[PDB]
Amino acid sequence: KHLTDNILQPKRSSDFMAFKYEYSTVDLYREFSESIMDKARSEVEILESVNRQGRYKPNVESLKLHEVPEWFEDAKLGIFLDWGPWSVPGYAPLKGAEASTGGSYPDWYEFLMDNLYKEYHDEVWGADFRRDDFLPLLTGENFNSEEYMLLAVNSGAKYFVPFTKHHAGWTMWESEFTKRNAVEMGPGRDIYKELIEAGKKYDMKMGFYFSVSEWEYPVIVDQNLSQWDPVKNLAIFQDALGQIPRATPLASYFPALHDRMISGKIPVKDYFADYMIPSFKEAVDKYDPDLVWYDGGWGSPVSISRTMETSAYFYNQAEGKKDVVINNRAGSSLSEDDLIKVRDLDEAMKIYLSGQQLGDYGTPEFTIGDVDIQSKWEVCRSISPAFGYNWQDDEASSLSGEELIKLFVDIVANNGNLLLVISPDGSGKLPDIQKDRLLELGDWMKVNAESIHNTRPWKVQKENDKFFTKSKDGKSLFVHCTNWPGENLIINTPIEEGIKGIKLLGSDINLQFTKASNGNLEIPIPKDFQNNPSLISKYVWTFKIDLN
């Protein structure tokens, strides 16, 4: 049904033995909780003092004054490295398990293996194979951080966002606040450090992806939750992150159920104050990222998660040092009363959107939808529906290079950035098909990058098969033709300014042009270009019009 004999399908090893980390959850409680909470209190005091003295305060109106940096307007393309324990099984259904975004989520395997993907998991991995048994298999033996950064550079990308910490809480960086980190578990390396160092060497802006909430977190409680609870003073914190109905805010903690899904996480009293805030601060302080990509901010509203404090801190510590940016996923600004009204209730969506007030730019996922092209936005997606590696993904399931380039041009014409997801396997190897699409995009950008990087939308974004961008200064208009226009390029959209010159990017030759009497621009195409226009540029041909 789900178990194939296809070599490409990751599956249970014949030598599988349970991963029992050196420290049980109770061991971490006894040995590390007090120490961590002590350290957290000191770090939170420092962060709060920085915010009290700093330009940015933890409130919507203060943070709103922060502006999108020039570099982020100009970047247009980022690489989103979706790699983590979920990369080992590398599975979602090719069809039929799409979320409301239209994507599919191999990167939700650690959660969905217990419900939506349980039949697959039980047949391919085994019911006795727990979430944390994927951690030792995340070897990174084929993961080369410099090669990933160079691939991103060569693709034309201007920022690189690793999945530094996703919903199950494994950190790509060596954290003092969790043993569920890349040094203790999986590759045995500070993967984030390697990527940060590579990004500095290649002059690449670096992101920090950070799940605000986690699916489960062991917490210290005064009173137990039921007569069945086996362990005094420990429970499991759960919020809305999982999306499915669950016990909230606390579930009863049972070692035989929970320990092998939360290996390495040190119990604390207050998930947000004692763990989330100090771990965020730690990564910002150590790695100095250019960009914060919150995720999982729907778990708890910001009145509880305190992400306005992490946002203010990030901006404050950047002052005078570098220009930085935050996405719009910190969480909701709504009051308890407004959150209740939404749950009770089109009318629910209007109230919800009113509470989405934090961040520098919008983050449509997979489907672009009805974007406001007057504000900055970024669409995230891979070359397929899949966020995270899908061993089944292939030529049939993935965009062609041609489709990817045309989609990219569309995005950029409409004021968007593309944050292009790449998804390695458990070894850290990138599938050849994803490598190929990056190479093809890179080859196209070699010719056409000046019509993409550092541009802005024009008064018109699309005309038939043409997409427009303009130089920052207004003096160059770029016409991206998604069909080879043949003998003649005709542009119907009025161009008020006089024209100094027109050229096809990829040719050093200046093109002929005249204005017809109906208003159209007519651009004859050299006979020598017709024989094989793909030699100049594949898929999309860009004409630069220099204005007076």
Ligand X SMILES: OC[C@@H]1O[C@H](O)[C@@H](O)[C@H](O)[C@H]1O
List Cβ neighbours of 353 (8 Å cut-off, separation of 6 or more): none
Residue 387 touching ligand X (CB under 6 A): yes
Q: Give the residue with the Cβ less far from a second copy, 260 or 470.
A: 260
Taking residues 64 to 83 in sequence order and writing x for each that binds Na ion by CB under 5 A, - otherwise, the string is: x-------------------
Location of structure tokens 């203790």:
184
Closest CB to a second copy among residues 257, 535: 257
Interaction between residue 365 and ligand X (CB under 6 A)? yes
Q: How buried is residue 16: exposed, middle or buried, by Cβ count under 10 Å (0-12/13-18/19+)?
A: middle
Partner whose binding site includes residue 99, from Na ion, a second copy, ligand X, none (CB under 5 to 8 Å by kind): a second copy
Of 398 and 542, the one with the shorter C-beta distance to ligand X is 398
* Contact characters 438-457, a second copy, x per CB under 8 A: --------------------
CA–CA dist 178, 524 (Å, integer) = 64
Q: What are 330's two structure tokens?
A: 């910190």
Interaction partner, residue 282 (a second copy, ligand X, Na ion, none; CB < 5-8 Å by kind):
none
112 interacts with, out of Na ion, a second copy, ligand X, none, CB within 5 to 8 A per kind: a second copy
Q: Residue 251 corresponds to which tokens in the numbers above?
A: 């579930």
For residue 208, what are the β-bridge partners? Answer: 292
Task: Give the interface segment with ligand X, choosing from 3-11, 27-35, 105-113, 495-503 (CB under 6 A).
Answer: 105-113
Q: Are 281 and 47 in contact (CB under 8 A)?
A: yes
Q: CB 433 → ligand X: shortest distance, Å?
A: 18
**How many Å apart are CA 412 and CA 334, to the nearest integer?**
32
Applying CB under 6 A, does 108 fall inside the site for ligand X?
yes
- Burial class from Cβ neighbours inside 10 Å (0-12, 13-18, 19+) for residue 347 reads exposed
CA 451/CA 505 separation, integer angstroms: 9
Closest CB 215 distance from ligand X, rounded Å: 10
Site string for a second copy, 245-264 (x = CB under 8 A): xxx--xxx-xxxx-------
Tell me the site size for a second copy, rule CB under 8 A.
32
**Closer to a second copy by Cβ: residue 243 or 335:** 243
How far apart (Å, rounded) are the C-alpha atoms in residues 368 and 411? 8
Pure H helices in 135-250: 145-155, 191-201
Q: Of 103-111, 266-274, 300-308, 449-457, which part binds ligand X (CB under 6 A)?
A: 103-111
Per-position b or e across 82-106, b if 16+ CB within 10 A of its CB:
bbbbbbbbbbbbbeebeeebebbbb
Q: Which of 55, 64, 70, 126 binds a second copy (CB under 8 A)?
A: 126
* Rounded Cα gap, residues 471 and 458, in angstroms: 9
How does DSSP assign 8-36, residue by residue?
TS----TT------SS-HHHHHHHTHHHH
Q: Give the residue with the Cβ less far from Na ion, 43 or 309.
A: 309
Q: Which strands form 514-515's sheet, in the order they lie side by side?
A: 488-491, 521-524, 514-515
Q: How many helices (H) and strands (E) does the chain have?
A: 18, 19
Interior angle at CA 547, CA 544 and CA 548, nearest 5: 160
Q: Which of residues 77-116 bind a second copy (CB under 8 A)?
A: 97, 99-100, 112, 114-116
Helix axes 307-318, 277-287, angle to 10 degrees: 20
Give the per-residue contact string, 266-305, with ligand X (x = CB under 6 A; - = no).
-----------------------------x----------
Closest distance to Na ion from the beta carbon of 360 (Å): 5
Chain breaks in the chain (C to N over 2.5 A) after: 345
> Binding to ligand X by residue 107, rule CB under 6 A?
yes
Least CB distance from residue 251 to a second copy, whole Å?
A: 5
User: Is 435 within 8 Å of 142 (Cβ atoms)?
Assistant: no
Give the residue at shortest CB distance from Na ion: 64
Size of the site for ligand X (CB under 6 A): 8
Q: Which stretch binds ligand X (CB under 6 A): 100-108, 175-183, 354-362, 508-516?
A: 100-108
110 vs 259 by CB, closer to ligand X: 110
Q: Nearer to ligand X by C-beta: 111 or 468?
A: 111
- Which does residue 380 bind out of ligand X, Na ion, a second copy, none, counting CB within 5 to 8 angstroms by kind? ligand X
Residues that bind a second copy (CB under 8 A): 97, 99-100, 112, 114-119, 122, 126-128, 225-230, 243-247, 250-252, 254-257
Residues that bind ligand X (CB under 6 A): 82, 105, 107-108, 295, 365, 380, 387
Residues that bind Na ion (CB under 5 A): 64
